[PDB]
Structures are given as C-alpha cells and as structure tokens.
Design a protein around this ligand. Structure first.
Ligand SMILES: NC(=O)c1ccc[n+]([C@@H]2O[C@H](COP(=O)([O-])OP(=O)(O)OC[C@H]3O[C@@H](n4cnc5c(N)ncnc54)[C@H](O)[C@@H]3O)[C@@H](O)[C@H]2O)c1
Ligand SMILES: NC(=O)c1ccc[n+]([C@@H]2O[C@H](COP(=O)([O-])OP(=O)(O)OC[C@H]3O[C@@H](n4cnc5c(N)ncnc54)[C@H](O)[C@@H]3O)[C@@H](O)[C@H]2O)c1
Ligand code: NI
Ligand code: NI
Lengths: 376, 375
C-alpha cells in the first residue's frame, strides 16, 4: 500500500497568473490549448504571462477531443522542431492527455506507442525512463483529474488504451475556477459525474488506502451536495467541484480505478461522448456489491448514509435529476449487440480490472453491459 | 494557495520490509535509531533488510529525544567519515529531525545552523540548495508527522528553532503499525494529542486549502474517536492513529502550524516533554476564537459538531479523560513567572505566528501563558 503525489497544485481565482513564477527568463515553453481556451481568452492570458516572464514560447491550438495516437504523431514534429524545456497544457483531460503523450515520445524517442500502451493486462508494457520536460497542467473541466494522474488515455482503432507512469504525473497543476465557470451545462454535468465515478472506484479499489480514501470521500461528498448547483451555474459550486475533481484525481492516482473505466474505455465507439461512465456506474456498483459489499458500506457510512443500498440510491437519483440518458437512448440494440462480445473481451483485458474489488469473468462484464442496455 | 507532498508513503503491518526494495547493492546507507527501536529489535530488522539488499551500511543508535545543535554537530563527523548516499531514520520525530539536520550540514557543508534556522520571522534565513542524500523516515510514534514535513526542530540554548525547506521532506515514509503498538500509554497519549493540535492549527491556518483541510479533518476525527481506544492497547486504533499522524503531517506541511507550536517551541525548557502542545491548545483556540471564529466553526461542522464552541469542549473533554496535567503541575510559579516575559517575546518572533488566524501581541501571548498557568 502506497500514497504519493508528484504534482504541485496551485489554486484560486486568478491562480493562472502563477505561470509567471513557474517559468524563467529564456525558458523554452510550448503551450497546447483547446479551441475553447483560445476563443474564451485564456490562451492570450497564458501568452501575456509568458511574455512578462521573458520566456521563449510558441503556441499550438485547436487540439481535438478524445485524442488518437495519430492525433499525437501529427503534433510531434512541431514539438521536436521547437525543442521546448516546458509544456503548458490548457484545456480538458483531452489536452492534458495529448501533452503527456507528447512528453513520452519527445523525451524517450526510442519508445513507440506500441511498446508502452497497456493493450492487455496479460502482456508486458515497457516502463518509462525519466522524462525531463516540465509539464504544467491547467484543467478547464471539473473534471478528468489528468492534472495529477499518472495516466494518458489515447485511442488506437476507436478503443481507449492507457500509458501509465509516475513520469507522466504533471509537475504542476493550476486550478483556476474562472476556466470551468465557462463549461456548457452538459460538460459540467458529464465531467462532474466522472468525479463521482473516480471517487467511488478509488475508494472500493483493492489499492485503496486511508490517504486516498480521505480525498475520495470528500470529492464524492462535494459532487453529491454541490454538482446540481454547479450545473445550474452557481460560481461557488463551480469552484468546490473544480477542487473535488482534483481530489478524486489524487484518490485514483493512488487507488486506481476499476470496472467502470475498463468498460467505458472499450465503449469509446459510443456517442455522445463522456456519458458512458455515469450510465455504467450503478450497474458496476450493483455487480461489485454482490460479493464485495464491505467498502461500499464503509463509504456510505463516511458520507453519513446508513448503508451501501442508500449510496447506490443517491447515485441513481443524482443521475436521474441531471437527466443522464439511458444507454438504450444513445445506441441502437443492433450496434450494441454486434460489438458486445468483442467489447466484453477487450474490457476484460483492461489493466483497471486488476483493481476492481471483484475479479469479473468476460461473461460477468457482458452481463453488466446487457443490464445497463436493457434497463429492465 | 498551494498543495504538495514530496514524500512517497509506504504503509501496512510489515511495510518495514520495503527497505529491501528502496536500497540497491553497494548503496552506502547510514541508519539512525532511538534506543527503543534498538531494544525492541526494529533496528536488527532494518540491518537484516540492508544485508539482504547487499548494501554498504553503518548504524548510529542511542539518539537523544528533543535534540540540540550540539547533538547534531557531535554526530556530523561520523556521517562525513562513512560518506553515506542514504539515511534511514528509525524512531520518533526526534530521530527524523536529527536525520534532517544532518542531511543539511552533510549535503551543504558551506551552511551553518546560524544561517538557515529561523531565529526571528523579522530576519531572513538562507534558503537550502538541492540536498542529494536520500532520507527514509520510519516513525515509531503517532506522532510528529516529521516523516512528511519540510521542518526540523532543533534546540539552541533551551529554545526550539526550525529549519524549513521542501529539501528536508523525506524521500520515503514507512508507516508500519508494529512500531507504534510498542508505545507506552503516556507516549501514545502525548503523540496522539499532537496529531489533534497539528490537525486544528493546519485547518484554521491562514495557508489552509480544501486539500490540506480534507487531511486535517480526517486526522482530527480519528484522534477524537480512536485515541482513547489506542492508549488502551487497541491494535486497530494504533494503526488508525498512526496513519492519522501522517495525515496531520500532510495537512501542516501545506497549512503550516500556528500560535500553539510558536508557544510550545519557546516553552521547550519545561520537562516533561510532549505535554505543552496539548496543555496550550484549548487556551490558544479560545484566544483565536474571539477574533477569528470562522474556520473553527467550519471545522466543527465538518466533524459533525453543532459549532466552534462544541469542538473546544470536545478538545477539553479529551484532555480531561486522558489526564493531561495542568501547567502548574510541571513547572514552579518561580520558574514560570521569571521566564514569562522573554518566552512571550521569543514566541512572538516564531515564524509560525505568521500563519495563526489572528496576529497576537507579545502581551496576548503572555496572557495565554498566564491563563494556562492559573487554571
Ligand atoms: N488521464 C487521465 O487520468 C484521465 C482520466 C479521465 C478521463 N480522461 C480522458 O479525458 C478526456 C475527457 O476530458 P474532459 O472530461 O476534461 O473533456 P474534454 O477535454 O474532452 O472536453 C470536452 C468538451 O468541453 C469543452 N470544454 C472544456 N472545458 C471547457 C470550458 N471551460 N469552457 C467551455 N468549453 C469547455 C471542450 O472544448 C470539448 O468540446 C477523455 O479522452 C478521457 O478518456 C483522462
Ligand atoms: N519536524 C517536524 O515537523 C516536527 C513536528 C512535530 C514535532 N517535532 C519534534 O519531534 C519531537 C517529538 O517526537 P515524538 O513525539 O515522536 O517523540 P520522541 O521521538 O521524542 O520520543 C519520545 C519517547 O518515546 C519513546 N518511543 C518512541 N516511539 C516508541 C515506540 N514505538 N515504542 C516505545 N518507545 C517509543 C522514545 O524512545 C522516547 O523516549 C520533538 O523534538 C518535537 O519538537 C517535529
Ligand atoms: Ni473517468
Ligand atoms: Ni507538534
């Protein structure tokens, strides 16, 4: 049992200004940004800080959502050409994950994706050498927790795979609630429910400790109390949920995740995106609560509920109040059916299955997917 | 507003065996331990792991509690003689604090104590350069939180001063509850109440964040619920309180401490040791609550109490039930009244005052000490 944190976290409204203090005169900085963070003026704000710092900088913008290995490879020549000492990742989990993947392939150019990505928990991946490029993560959602995690989630053939290394942990995270105050309702809802998924999975993980549990319970408490207020546009709730998103990231960095993310990774072919975690969570909770009820009971008591059954009800009621669609509403029975057997096999191979409080069969995973689809 | 943790925390019963993982063949390792960690056979367990790792090692034992700069200077030549790459600090806050002070003076031999210790918050101390000696902190009490903190607490002339630098944060902390299970009742009480002092001062600190607050509340909740069970020999509660001490450590690494530790640093000339933080806490809370109730109320409600007034009552009741002495049991009215003025002046200059929710005068600190003596 281990607990660490590689990331120095700076927080508060206006904390984006810290960039001035983190970068030195003549430091070679490459800024990666989403279309959102460009349009909304946050990229300009970072450039003006780098200008005041007298840094040597360049900006790559309009990084895509749900990044592929092809997305990464297309950016890599620009990276090598500029020869940065420092990355700033301004945007969502998508932008922070693109930057982590570029950090690997820039700092360790002997390593290709196919050598380090965990395609199957039954096949060895190469560990990462020391990666010297400084990474400053500035999340715009609340949130993926990528600003502290050891993982980058990259698609190859419409399946999400991970590279996981403590070397990928961002050197610095800046948590400036001014950014997420700009999320559209559905982005605030989806990324806020991912916090709750992260917190519950980290708490019931085989890898859980009291240290990860303290962060996981507080993040979960904040989502259950504050998320509806944040989705309605309460700035105080937007701050609390932004910090809860990172608290859950600290939890799952140490505690790891579980079946929910193994099954959402391998259901990335489904649109809309960023729904499937929220939808699958209760079905995975009900499966795990069969043989491994104990840690769900423990978390429910810590959250001031009587038992695991009441925590499950609170999760289903929050999803209901935030109008999370049924799986059957966002995928046809034929398309779901034709991909089910391979999805279930690929999910079973995902390394997050090793942390799940119960070891699933392929058939157990297939039956969880079916249960979520039927919604009988 | 910042949150970090430089230390990798390894935990569980038998986690002491991780030493065999963290040390490579031919690594030069210097082990510091207390007499109790030698006598109870934890030093032999560590040497046995270093032997299995094929390390080049040496052991220094019989390290004093409440260490001085003279203590540290007397050991420095033995450190230089052996030329270690790695320290293992096996014992209480005292042993980890000695190990931290030696890491400064070994790694930066151009810096003396008088250049890096914060004698006064009104005068610059030198910042520390990169210190490359790896430090593995194995706390035996529950506890100082020194195994994750950026601080070492060293006496000069019977007053506690600090060196504070992220460079002093141990590389690794091993939390193995077999060690603190051996604490006699009084040591379990004193170090446990220190956790609660740490947790409350970190929460109400001017440098509090939601991250440090989460660690501080869970640490405080564990002490209020479990410390009596632990004092009474409950192995579950010993484990819980051991991890609570490090949580309060994470909390104060970030949040810092306040007027309780400023006042206990400058009252270091009182024996016994370890009581003064627990004695002073309620009086400092009452002082701070007059002007800055807000964070005490927030902490009370997090702990599922109705208000700041009830948290204060719960602290006072715990001290009562675990038989914390009054200040006038452990110091003559002669002694006290004679040093009160200079102690108050020197507590006022302690950098930890900068983090207290309320800026005290010297006279305020004088009157807190007076209310403690006169209860
Ligand atoms: N590496 C990890 O540990 C980890 C953990 C969980 C998820 N992920 C990955 O992260 C990705 C999802 O990241 P995400 O949830 O942050 O979303 P995202 O980065 O994919 O962005 C979602 C959408 O919201 C928009 N947006 C983001 N912030 C905005 C803001 N403040 N104002 C306006 N619009 C804004 C984006 O432009 C985009 O259209 C997925 O690829 C997922 O697999 C990573
Ligand atoms: N550096 C920091 O951040 C920090 C924080 C708090 C306190 N401190 C310092 O730490 C010191 C106090 O540390 P402490 O409270 O851990 O006590 P300690 O290290 O002074 O030891 C107290 C006594 O208990 C004995 N003991 C300790 N563990 C035992 C065990 N498991 N079994 C049997 N006997 C045991 C010791 O041998 C000693 O006699 C003080 O000098 C204080 O100023 C520093
Ligand atoms: Ni997620
Ligand atoms: Ni203390």
């Amino acid at each position: 049992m281990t607990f660490f944190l590689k990331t120095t976290i700076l927080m508060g409204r206006g904390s984006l200004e810290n960039i001035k203090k983190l970068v030195s005169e003549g430091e070679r900085v490459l800024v990666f940004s989403s279309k959102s963070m460009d349009r909304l003026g946050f990229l300009k704000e970072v450039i003006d800080y780098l200008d005041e710092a007298g840094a040597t900088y360049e900006s790559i913008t309009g990084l895509p959502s749900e990044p592929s290995i092809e997305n990464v490879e297309e950016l890599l020549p620009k990276v090598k050409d500029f020869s940065p000492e420092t990355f700033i990742a301004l945007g969502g989990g998508s932008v922070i994950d693109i930057s982590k993947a570029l950090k690997v392939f820039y700092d360790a150019p002997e390593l290709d994706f196919d050598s380090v990505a965990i395609f199957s928990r039954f096949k060895k991946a190469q560990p990462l050498p020391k990666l010297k490029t400084k990474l400053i993560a500035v999340p715009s959602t609340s949130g993926a927790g990528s600003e502290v995690s050891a993982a980058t989630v990259i698609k190859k053939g419409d399946i999400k795979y991970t590279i996981v290394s403590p070397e990928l942990c961002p050197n610095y995270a800046i948590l400036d609630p001014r950014l997420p105050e700009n999320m559209p309702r559905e982005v605030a809802r989806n990324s806020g429910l991912d916090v709750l998924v992260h917190a519950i999975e980290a708490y019931v993980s085989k890898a859980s400790t009291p240290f990860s549990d303290a962060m996981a319970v507080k993040a979960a408490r904040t989502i259950l109390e504050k998320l509806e207020d944040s989705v309605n546009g309460d700035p105080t709730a937007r701050e609390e949920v932004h910090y809860a998103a990172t608290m859950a990231g600290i939890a799952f960095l140490n505690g790891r995740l579980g079946l929910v993310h193994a099954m959402s990774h391998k259901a990335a072919w489904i649109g809309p995106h960023g729904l499937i975690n929220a939808i699958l969570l209760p079905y995975v909770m009900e499966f795990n609560m069969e043989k491994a009820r104990e840690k769900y009971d423990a978390m429910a008591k810590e959250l001031g509920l009587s038992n695991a059954e009441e925590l499950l009800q609170k999760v289903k009621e929050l999803n209901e109040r935030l109008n999370v669609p049924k799986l059957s509403e966002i995928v046809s029975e034929e398309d779901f059916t034709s991909r089910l057997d391979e999805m279930s096999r690929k999910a079973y191979e995902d390394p997050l299955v090793n942390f799940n409080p119960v070891e699933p069969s392929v058939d157990d995973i297939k039956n969880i997917y079916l249960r979520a689809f039927h919604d009988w």
